[PDB]
Design an enzyme around this catalytic site. Structure first.
Site, PDB file in Angstrom:
ATOM      1  N   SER A   1      28.559 -14.460  48.157  1.00 61.10           N
ATOM      2  CA  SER A   1      28.671 -14.766  49.609  1.00 61.10           C
ATOM      3  C   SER A   1      28.001 -13.773  50.514  1.00 61.10           C
ATOM      4  O   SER A   1      26.810 -13.535  50.403  1.00 61.10           O
ATOM      5  CB  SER A   1      30.141 -14.868  50.054  1.00 61.10           C
ATOM      6  OG  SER A   1      30.504 -16.141  50.570  1.00 61.10           O
TER       7      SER A   1
ATOM      8  N   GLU B   1      29.952 -26.173  45.997  1.00 61.94           N
ATOM      9  CA  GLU B   1      30.148 -25.081  46.940  1.00 61.94           C
ATOM     10  C   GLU B   1      31.014 -25.458  48.136  1.00 61.94           C
ATOM     11  O   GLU B   1      32.002 -24.771  48.441  1.00 61.94           O
ATOM     12  CB  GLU B   1      28.794 -24.562  47.446  1.00 61.94           C
ATOM     13  CG  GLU B   1      27.996 -23.738  46.430  1.00 61.94           C
ATOM     14  CD  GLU B   1      28.437 -22.269  46.377  1.00 61.94           C
ATOM     15  OE1 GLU B   1      27.884 -21.498  45.562  1.00 61.94           O
ATOM     16  OE2 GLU B   1      29.316 -21.874  47.172  1.00 61.94           O
TER      17      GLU B   1
ATOM     18  N   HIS C   1      32.944 -22.822  46.190  1.00 62.93           N
ATOM     19  CA  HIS C   1      32.516 -21.487  46.601  1.00 62.93           C
ATOM     20  C   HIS C   1      33.608 -20.473  46.240  1.00 62.93           C
ATOM     21  O   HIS C   1      34.782 -20.737  46.477  1.00 62.93           O
ATOM     22  CB  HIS C   1      32.249 -21.494  48.125  1.00 62.93           C
ATOM     23  CG  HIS C   1      31.611 -20.253  48.648  1.00 62.93           C
ATOM     24  ND1 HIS C   1      30.336 -19.867  48.297  1.00 62.93           N
ATOM     25  CD2 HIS C   1      32.061 -19.329  49.532  1.00 62.93           C
ATOM     26  CE1 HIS C   1      30.039 -18.741  48.928  1.00 62.93           C
ATOM     27  NE2 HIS C   1      31.066 -18.394  49.682  1.00 62.93           N
TER      28      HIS C   1
END
Ligand SMILES: *[B]([O])([O])C1=[C]C(Br)=C([C])[C]=[C]1
Length: 566
Positions: free
Chosen positions: A214, A347, A467
Site C-alpha cells: 500500500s 483488491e 487489499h
C-alpha cells in the site's frame, strides 16, 4: 466505530503483552550502532523459533518542538548502551478501531530482527515500510511481527515514519523550511542508517531489499525514484501500490490553512502565521481534525487523503520529490535494480467498509465519470468527452443494466491499483537500463488465518482476496495462531517468505526449493509484451496471463486522444 471489537481488541491487547512476555527470554545482547551501542533480547515464536530483537533504535532526532513539520535530523550519540528490548510508540494517528487518537510525535524509530547475530556470511537485509495511507501504521510486532521471516537467514528491519499532517504538511513559503514530504524524508534517513549499520547485525550492506504494501509500496517506489537514495539498496518489491497511484500523492499546500481553521486559527491565510499556529497546536487535535480537511469537491474527485506525498514547491538539501513522480521515473536510478510488483486478486474488496457507510457511491457507476483520471476529466465532469471516457470504464466493470457493489469494488481494483501499475510499467519501459520486473498476483484465499485489517474492512465472512489480505502470510499479528505444518496457510507462509527471501537474495524470485514451484517458469515482463504474465499465487503456484489485462487495456483506451498524458 464499534463498542464490541473495542472490548475484544482490548482483550487480546492484554494477551499480546502477556504472550509477548512469555515468548521473551532472559538472553540479552549488545550491538554497536554508529550512534553508540544498543541492547537487544532474544525472543520466541509460536513455531518455537528464535530471533534477536532490537526495537526502539532512533534513526532521527525526535521531531518535536521546533522540529515539527521539519526534515528529520540525525540524532544524538551516546556513551554507554541504549536500551532496545521494548518498542517505542507509533506516529500520532487515529485508531480505526476505537476512533480515538493514539501514538506520539516521538516515533522515529526502527526495529532490527535476525535469528543469528553472527552468521559467518553477510546476509540479505530486508527493510519493510508499512502502509496505511500515510495516516496510520506502526512497526509494532502486534501487527508486523517478524516471526515468519526469521525462519529464514536474513536480517529484517521494520521502520516508522511520521504520518498525516505531522508527516506531510507542505508550505509554499521558502522562508519556513516546510517544503513537505517530511515522512518520506524520515524513510530516507532510515535507509541511510540501515546502509551504514546493518553490517553490525550480520547484514550485507551490498545486498539490501526495500519492500512495502500500500502506502508502503508507494513509499518503496519513492525510495526508488528519489536521487537521495541512489545505490542504497539493490532490490525493490511493490506490494499493491506505487508512486503514481492517484492516492499516492497530493498537492496539499492550500490545506494547511484549512487544518489551522478547523483547529480554531484566527487570522488570514499566510504560511508564516498558519505554521506558527500549527507549530503550537496539540498533536492529537490536528490529527483528529484531519478527517475534515478535504472539501466535498476533493472527495468527489477521489482525493483520498488531505496530506500525503507531494511535489515540493522548492528544492532544498533534503528534498525528496522535486517533480511529479511520473517525471522522476524518467531518471530514476531504481529503474535499474531488480523489481517485483504485484496485486491481490480482488483488491477493491477492501472498500466494502466504505461502501456500506455510503451506498450512494454505487450510483457513481451509472456513468463512471467520477473515476475518469482527473488529469483527463473536466472540473464538473459533465463534458461529453468525460462521459465518453466514463463509458469505457463502465463497459469494463458494469456487468448488468444496473451497477452493483461488486462492480464498484472491481472497478476500485483498477482505479487504485491495476491501472497505475500498467502506467508505471509502460512509462518505466521507455526509461530503463533493461533490468527485469517480475509480477505476482496474490490469490490465496482463507479465513482460518487473518490480520486486523480484515476487521476494519469488515471482510469477515466475505470471499475473495482483498487489499492487505496477503500481509497475513508475511507477518505475525495478534489475531494469528500457530497453524498445522501441513495446512494450506502454513504452506503459503513458507512460499511467500521463501519467494521474498529468494528475490532479496538473488534478485530473481524463482527457486526450485519452494513447494509448488517445480514447473513454474517465472519470466519477467518485457517492453514488447502485449499481455502481462504473472505468478498467480494460490493453493497452486501458477504462471498465467494477468486476468485483469483486458480491463487494463480498456482503461488505457481513455487515453486514445491524449497519448501524451498516459
Ligand atoms: B493502503 O492500505 O495504504 C491503501 C489504502 C487505501 Br484507503 C487506498 C485507496 C489505497 C491504498
Amino acid at each position: 466505530v464499534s463498542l464490541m471489537e473495542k472490548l475484544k481488541w482490548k482483550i487480546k491487547c492484554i494477551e499480546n503483552k502477556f504472550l509477548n512476555y512469555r515468548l521473551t527470554t532472559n538472553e540479552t545482547v549488545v550491538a554497536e550502532t554508529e550512534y553508540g551501542k544498543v541492547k537487544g533480547v532474544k525472543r520466541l515464536t509460536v513455531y518455537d523459533d528464535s530471533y534477536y530483537s532490537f526495537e526502539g533504535i532512533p534513526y532521527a532526532q525526535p521531531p518535536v518542538g521546533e522540529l515539527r513539520f521539519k526534515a528529520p535530523q540525525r540524532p544524538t550519540p551516546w556513551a554507554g548502551v541504549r536500551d532496545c528490548c521494548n518498542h517505542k510508540d507509533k506516529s500520532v494517528q487515529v485508531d480505526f478501531i476505537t476512533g480515538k487518537v493514539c501514538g506520539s510525535e516521538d516515533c522515529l524509530y526502527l526495529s532490527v530482527y535476525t535469528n543469528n547475530l553472527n552468521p559467518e556470511t553477510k546476509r540479505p537485509v530486508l527493510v519493510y515500510i508499512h502502509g496505511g495511507g500515510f495516516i496510520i501504521g506502526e512497526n509494532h510486532r502486534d501487527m508486523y511481527g517478524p516471526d515468519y521471516f526469521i525462519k529464514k537467514d536474513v536480517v529484517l528491519i521494520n521502520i516508522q515514519y511520521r504520518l498525516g499532517a505531522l508527516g506531510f504538511l507542505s508550505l509554499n513559503s521558502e522562508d519556513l523550511n516546510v517544503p513537505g514530504n517530511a515522512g518520506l524524508k524520515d524513510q530516507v534517513m532510515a535507509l541511510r542508517w540501515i546502509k551504514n549499520n546493518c553490517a553490525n547485525f550480520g547484514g550485507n550492506p551490498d545486498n539490501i531489499t526495500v519492500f512495502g504494501e500500500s502506502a508502503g509500496a508507494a513509499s518503496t517506489h519513492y525510495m526508488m525514484l528519489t536521487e537521495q537514495t541512489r545505490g542504497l539498496f539493490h532490490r525493490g518489491i511493490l506490494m499493491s501500490g506505487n508512486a503514481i497511484c492517484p492516492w499516492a500523492n497530493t498537492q496539499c499546500q492550500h490545506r494547511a490553512f484549512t487544518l489551522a481553521k478547523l483547529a480554531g486559527y484566527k487570522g488570514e491565510d499566510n504560511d508564516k502565521d498558519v505554521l506558527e499556529f500549527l507549530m503550537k497546536a496539540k498533536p492529537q487535535d490536528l490529527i483528529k481534525l484531519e478527517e475534515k480537511v478535504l472539501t466535498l469537491e476533493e472527495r468527489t474527485n477521489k482525493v483520498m487523503f488531505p496530506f500525503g506525498p507531494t511535489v515540493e514547491p522548492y528544492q532544498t538539501a533534503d528534498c525528496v520529490l522535486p517533480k511529479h513522480p511520473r517525471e522522476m521515473v524518467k531518471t530514476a536510478w531504481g529503474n535499474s535494480i531488480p523489481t517485483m510488483m504485484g496485486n491481490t486478486s480482488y483488491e477493491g474488496l477492501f472498500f466494502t467498509s466504505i461502501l456500506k457507510q455510503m451506498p450512494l457511491l454505487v450510483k457513481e457507476l451509472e456513468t463512471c465519470v467520477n473515476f475518469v483520471p482527473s488529469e483527463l476529466a473536466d472540473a464538473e465532469r459533465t463534458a461529453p468527452e468525460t462521459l465518453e471516457m466514463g463509458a469505457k470504464i463502465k463497459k469494463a466493470h458494469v456487468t448488468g443494466e444496473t451497477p452493483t457493489a461488486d462492480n464498484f469494488m472491481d472497478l476500485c481494483s483498477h482505479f487504485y491499483f491495476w491501472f497505475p501499475m500498467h502506467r508505471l510499467l509502460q512509462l518505466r519501459f521507455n526509461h530503463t537500463s533493461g533490468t527485469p520486473v517480475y509480477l505476482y498476483r496474490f490469490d490465496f484465499d482463507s479465513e482460518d488465518l487473518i490480520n486486523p485489517y480484515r476487521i476494519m474492512r469488515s471482510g469477515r465472512g466475505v470471499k475473495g482476496v482483498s487489499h492487505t489480505d496477503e500481509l497475513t502470510y508475511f507477518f505475525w499479528n495478534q489475531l494469528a495462531k500457530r497453524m498445522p505444518k501441513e495446512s494450506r496457510e502454513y504452506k503459503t507462509i513458507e512460499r511467500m517468505t521463501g519467494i521474498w527471501t529468494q528475490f532479496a537474495t538473488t534478485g530473481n524470485p524463482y527457486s526450485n526449493e519452494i513447494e509448488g514451484m517445480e514447473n513454474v517458469s517465472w519470466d519477467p515482463i518485457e517492453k514488447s509484451d502485449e499481455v502481462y504474465k504473472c505468478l498467480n499465487i494460490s493453493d497452486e503456484l501458477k504462471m498465467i496471463d494477468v486476468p485483469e489485462m483486458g480491463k487494463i487495456k480498456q482503461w488505457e483506451s481513455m487515453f486514445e486522444k491524449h497519448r501524451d498524458l498516459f
